[PDB]
Amino acid sequence: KGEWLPGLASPDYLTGSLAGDNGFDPLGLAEDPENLKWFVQAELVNGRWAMLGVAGMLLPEVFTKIGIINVPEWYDAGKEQYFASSSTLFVIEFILFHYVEIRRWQDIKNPGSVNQDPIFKQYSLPKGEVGYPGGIFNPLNFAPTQEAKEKELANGRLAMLAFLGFVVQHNVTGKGPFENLLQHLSDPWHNTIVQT
Amino acid sequence: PDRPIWFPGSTPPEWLDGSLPGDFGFDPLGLSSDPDSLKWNVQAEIVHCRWAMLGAAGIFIPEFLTKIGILNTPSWYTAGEQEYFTDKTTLFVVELILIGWAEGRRWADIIKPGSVNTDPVFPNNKLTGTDVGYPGGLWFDPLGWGSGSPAKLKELRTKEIKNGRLAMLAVMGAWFQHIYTGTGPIDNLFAHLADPGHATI
Amino acid sequence: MRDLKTYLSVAPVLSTLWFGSLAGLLIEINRLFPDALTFPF
Amino acid sequence: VFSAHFGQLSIIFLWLSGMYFHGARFSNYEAWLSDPTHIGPSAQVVWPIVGQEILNGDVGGGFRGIQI
Amino acid sequence: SGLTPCKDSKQFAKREKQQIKKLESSLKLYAPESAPALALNAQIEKTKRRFDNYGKYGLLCGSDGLPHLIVNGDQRHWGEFITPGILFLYIAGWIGWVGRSYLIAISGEKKPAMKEIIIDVPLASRIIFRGFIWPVAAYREFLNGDLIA
Ligand code: CLA
Ligand code: CLA
Numbered sequence: 076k077g078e079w080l081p082g083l084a085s086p087d088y089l090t091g092s093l094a095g096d097n098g099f100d101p102l103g104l105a106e107d108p109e110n111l112k113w114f115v116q117a118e119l120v121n122g123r124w125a126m127l128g129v130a131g132m133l134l135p136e137v138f139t140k141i142g143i144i145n146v147p148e149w150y151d152a153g154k155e156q157y158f159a160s161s162s163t164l165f166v167i168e169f170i171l172f173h174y175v176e177i178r179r180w181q182d183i184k185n186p187g188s189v190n191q192d193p194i195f196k197q198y199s200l201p202k203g204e205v206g207y208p209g210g211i212f213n214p215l216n217f218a219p220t221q222e223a224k225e226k227e228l229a230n231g232r233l234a235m236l237a238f239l240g241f242v243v244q245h246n247v248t249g250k251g252p253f254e255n256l257l258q259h260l261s262d263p264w265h266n267t268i269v270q271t
Numbered sequence: 272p273d274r275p276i277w278f279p280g281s282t283p284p285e286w287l288d289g290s291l292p293g294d295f296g297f298d299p300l301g302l303s304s305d306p307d308s309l310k311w312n313v314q315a316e317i318v319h320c321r322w323a324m325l326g327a328a329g330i331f332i333p334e335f336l337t338k339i340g341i342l343n344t345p346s347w348y349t350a351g352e353q354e355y356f357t358d359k360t361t362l363f364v365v366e367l368i369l370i371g372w373a374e375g376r377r378w379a380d381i382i383k384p385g386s387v388n389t390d391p392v393f394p395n396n397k398l399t400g401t402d403v404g405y406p407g408g409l410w411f412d413p414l415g416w417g418s419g420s421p422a423k424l425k426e427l428r429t430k431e432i433k434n435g436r437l438a439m440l441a442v443m444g445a446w447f448q449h450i451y452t453g454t455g456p457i458d459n460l461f462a463h464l465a466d467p468g469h470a471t472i
Numbered sequence: 473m474r475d476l477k478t479y480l481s482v483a484p485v486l487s488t489l490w491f492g493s494l495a496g497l498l499i500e501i502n503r504l505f506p507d508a509l510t511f512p513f
Numbered sequence: 514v515f516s517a518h519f520g521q522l523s524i525i526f527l528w529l530s531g532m533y534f535h536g537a538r539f540s541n542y543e544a545w546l547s548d549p550t551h552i553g554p555s556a557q558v559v560w561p562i563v564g565q566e567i568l569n570g571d572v573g574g575g576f577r578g579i580q581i
Numbered sequence: 582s583g584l585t586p587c588k589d590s591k592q593f594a595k596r597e598k599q600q601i602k603k604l605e606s607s608l609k610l611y612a613p614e615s616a617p618a619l620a621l622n623a624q625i626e627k628t629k630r631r632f633d634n635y636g637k638y639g640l641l642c643g644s645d646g647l648p649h650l651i652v653n654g655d656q657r658h659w660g661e662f663i664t665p666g667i668l669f670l671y672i673a674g675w676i677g678w679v680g681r682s683y684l685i686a687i688s689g690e691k692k693p694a695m696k697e698i699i700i701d702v703p704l705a706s707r708i709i710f711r712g713f714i715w716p717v718a719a720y721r722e723f724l725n726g727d728l729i730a
């Protein structure tokens with residue numbers, strides 16, 4: 076089992092059965108076993124959403140830079156006009172996300188409670204651990220072994236860090252995310268956080 | 272028990288039994304009564320002595336070669352004002368990161384010995400040292416001088432510690448000589464040797 | 473010595489050290505950002 | 514009792530040393546000595562931190578401070 | 582509410598001018614290069630910058646020429662009371678959580694009263710860092726039911 080700091084004994088409440096475990100808890104936030112489950116689910120959801128956001132706000136910048144397409148940066152996408160008003164799209168989002176989020180919340184409370192379709196009674200998801208619905212959400216039927224879960228959690232943590240870095244990049248420098256990387260490579264020892 | 276003491280005819284403290292290398296029973300203030308304090312202070316002294324040997328040789332050797340006429344390097348006091356390819360704060364940050372990894376590994380070794388004796392990424396390579404503060408291994412002890420009869424190890428560690436105390440004193444002396452007289456350390460030595468009686472204050 | 477550490481951890485000495493550090497810090501901000509009434513951030 | 518008296522004597526001597534030193538470095542003693550009647554004695558000076566330097570009045574002799 | 586901005590307050594300007602005139606009255610008493618004169622010259626600049634900054638932040642002055650604070654919750658005056666309020670609440674919660682967490686740790690000892698006089702510094706240093714996440718910690722502890730005895 077991995078250790079986040081050699082010479083430091085891991086906390087006892089982290090038995091190592093969970094995926095992506097390294098005994099990292101200096102503040103002891105997961106001392107209560109109940110809090111551990113909620114924190115695990117929150118970490119998973121935040122990781123997935125941050126992964127999607129970082130990918131979707133990094134790739135179009137590269138595509139615009141190379142010359143395949145012409146799309147503005149990630150921060151100024153709000154000024155562009157669309158076929159519907161922003162309030163209308165927000166109303167669609169607010170109604171739409173409520174259903175799925177309440178479904179997930181209901182699963183978190185009672186596992187296996189919402190596995191049955193509410194309109195058509197003959198379709199349902201197979202039993203599984205909470206936070207990994209499986210079934211239709213895994214159309215290719217990949218093996219959900221522990222190694223794949225560890226890979227997912229590691230990528231999620233890296234995505235969280237990357238998103239925070241992107242936000243701080245835009246707040247201070249005021250330039251694009253990929254523009255900064257090219258600026259750093261031109262003169263590595265003269266273009267750094269120290270100068271700015 | 273019968274080893275030479277710093278103050279002959281006096282009674283050495285009861286927590287200094289002479290087992291440690293370079294022990295002369297000198298602790299009038301009793302700053303190391305507790306065993307943990309003893310171990311921490313021993314590690315601090317060893318690190319200070321090694322850094323002193325590293326620094327002392329880097330101050331007088333360049334100035335000797337400069338005054339003798341071989342090189343032209345500036346004074347050690349003003350070496351922090353010279354031109355460099357990048358701002359000194361960037362160099363400070365890089366140094367901080369590298370020395371941070373090194374000193375963090377060393378700190379992990381002190382608290383829980385034997386916890387950092389294996390290569391994190393190549394488990395084949397290990398370090399063969401057994402005592403804290405003397406890592407050994409191929410990385411640090413290539414010539415095999417760190418292992419042998421206990422008497423030889425004790426004598427070698429004693430001579431290393433004595434050289435370290437001398438180096439620490441010499442480095443502080445160089446600093447104060449240059450703050451006072453306003454010239455290089457070698458110039459002070461030559462001025463003293465020219466007229467030992469009068470060339471002081 | 474151990475007694476030196478034990479006497480240094482007693483309530484009055486520790487409280488005085490903490491309050492002195494606190495007062496020094498507060499004077500530092502009051503010197504760095506003098507005559508402050510509103511947050512300009 | 515003997516040792517307590519010795520400690521009190523030490524404290525008194527420290528107080529006298531402070532009083533004698535402050536009049537040498539932070540005082541207008543010489544200017545007052547050149548004109549005792551029209552100059553107000555002073556031996557204390559305040560740091561300008563929170564606007565408290567208003568206590569440095571014009572006591573005369575080209576000096577600003579608290580009149581003792 | 583009948584209040585005018587600082588930048589357009591004739592009484593504010595009069596206060597600034599009067600303070601500067603009073604300060605300059607004592608400057609004429611010393612030689613221009615002297616240390617008291619140098620110290621006095623630094624006071625005038627401080628007053629000028631203070632008045633400029635007060636005018637620049639959109640503070641509201643009444644008929645007196647003195648700024649007033651609006652704490653009703655207006656979005657244009659959140660820096661007066663709302664912004665410093667949350668900071669104070671966070672800091673006070675940090676202090677209270679640290680103090681509460683220290684007492685619980687030593688309550689299980691045989692003589693818990695002895696640790697309230699000779700503070701266990703190695704134990705206290707560990708708890709200090711834990712107060713950074715006090716809002717989350719208290720929110721989670723309230724739901725679980727461990728907040729109240
Ligand atoms: C920082 C350097 C340093 C350190 C950590 C030590 C540490 C130690 N020495 Mg040591 N030593 C040093 C420098 C140092 N020495 C030097 C330069 C000399 C030559 C003069 C010696 C000569 C010496 C002898 C002869 C002996 C030791 C011994 C010991 C051990 C027991 C004493 C002890 O714990 O005191 C704690 C030591 C400290 C340095 C703690 C710091 C306390 C003071 C306050 C430091 C500041 C002093 C400074 C001059 C005051 C500045 C104020 C003002 C002038 C500005 C201990 C491991 C004894 C032993 O058994 O060795 C194994 C022993 O017999 N030392
Ligand atoms: C290795 C130790 C060492 C050595 C060899 C020297 C040597 C010298 N120092 Mg010196 N010095 C030292 C440490 C040392 N110092 C320290 C630690 C300080 C800070 C307190 C000073 C402060 C100092 C000043 C301010 C001046 C000198 C000067 C001098 C030179 C003239 C002699 C003199 O008046 O010194 C007097 C030395 C002292 C008052 C310090 C006491 C000696 C220390 C404690 C070491 C104790 C002796 C040592 C154990 C002997 C064994 C080593 C031996 C092989 C040399 C001479 C080359 C003068 C100069 O520039 O020459 C013109 C001068 O003005 N030194």
Ligand SMILES: CC(/C=C/C=C(C)/C=C/[C@@]12O[C@]1(C)C[C@@H](O)CC2(C)C)=C\C=C\C=C(C)\C=C\C=C(C)\C=C\[C@@]12O[C@]1(C)C[C@@H](O)CC2(C)C
Nearest residue numbers: 100101102104121124125128131132149152235236238239
């Ligand atoms: C999810 C996430 C990001 C979501 C982003 C999305 C959707 C982006 C979307 C957009 O791009 C598109 C789509 C369009 C862009 O135009 C429009 C926007 C909207 C901009 C970030 C999480 C980001 C979360 C972060 C970074 C969290 C870091 C937390 C840390 C480190 C905790 C550390 C500790 O917790 C441990 C580690 C142990 C604890 O015991 C104690 C300590 C030590 C304290």
Ligand SMILES: CC(/C=C/C=C(C)/C=C/[C@@]12O[C@]1(C)C[C@@H](O)CC2(C)C)=C\C=C\C=C(C)\C=C\C=C(C)\C=C\[C@@]12O[C@]1(C)C[C@@H](O)CC2(C)C
Nearest residue numbers: 298299300301322323325326329330347350439440442443
């Ligand atoms: C520790 C020290 C002094 C020691 C103090 C002593 C004796 C204390 C002794 C006692 O405690 C005992 C034992 C017992 C107690 O009961 C009593 C006292 C009396 C309290 C000296 C040096 C201590 C520290 C040293 C030696 C520092 C070294 C510095 C270096 C390496 C500098 C390197 C560079 O110079 C280069 C090479 C090139 C330049 O260009 C750049 C720079 C960076 C300047």
